[PDB]
């Protein structure tokens, strides 16, 4: 149909402003730090701590298979990605501190987004 079309091409735009959205967040990360799964060969333990572990390229799969319906969704994930690692490392370590100086850049980026979002619907 018709309708189910016009969704579509909802979701295609909305993958786009998305993946905008990604590339200026990870800028965000210059260290790239969160680029990448944490590896479970080197952190054996991890999923004992953390029950769902995210990170920029885990994001950019799901982006690229247009699996976010909703900016929520996309918060959402990158919200894991800063709340896992300030539970996992201490505050004193330079990978919490990486969390959170990306949490306050991205929150500025997210801020106009939604609006983006709302504004071209």
Do not use: W
Not at 56 to 64: G, I, P, S, V
Request: aromatic letters at 8%; a negative charge.
């Amino acid at each position: 149909s018709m309708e189910q079309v016009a969704m579509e091409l909802r979701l295609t735009e909305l993958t786009r402003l998305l993946r905008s959205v990604l590339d200026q967040l990870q800028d965000k990360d210059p260290a790239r730090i969160f680029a990448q799964p944490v590896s479970l060969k080197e952190v054996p333990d991890y999923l004992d701590h953390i029950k769902h572990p995210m990170d920029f390229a885990t994001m950019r799969k799901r982006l690229e298979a247009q699996g976010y319906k909703n900016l929520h969704e996309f918060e959402e994930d990158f919200d894991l990605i800063i709340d896992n690692c300030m539970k996992y490392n201490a505050r004193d370590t330079v990978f919490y501190r990486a969390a959170v100086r990306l949490r306050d850049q991205g929150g500025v980026v997210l801020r106009q987004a939604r609006r983006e979002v709302d504004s071209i619907g």
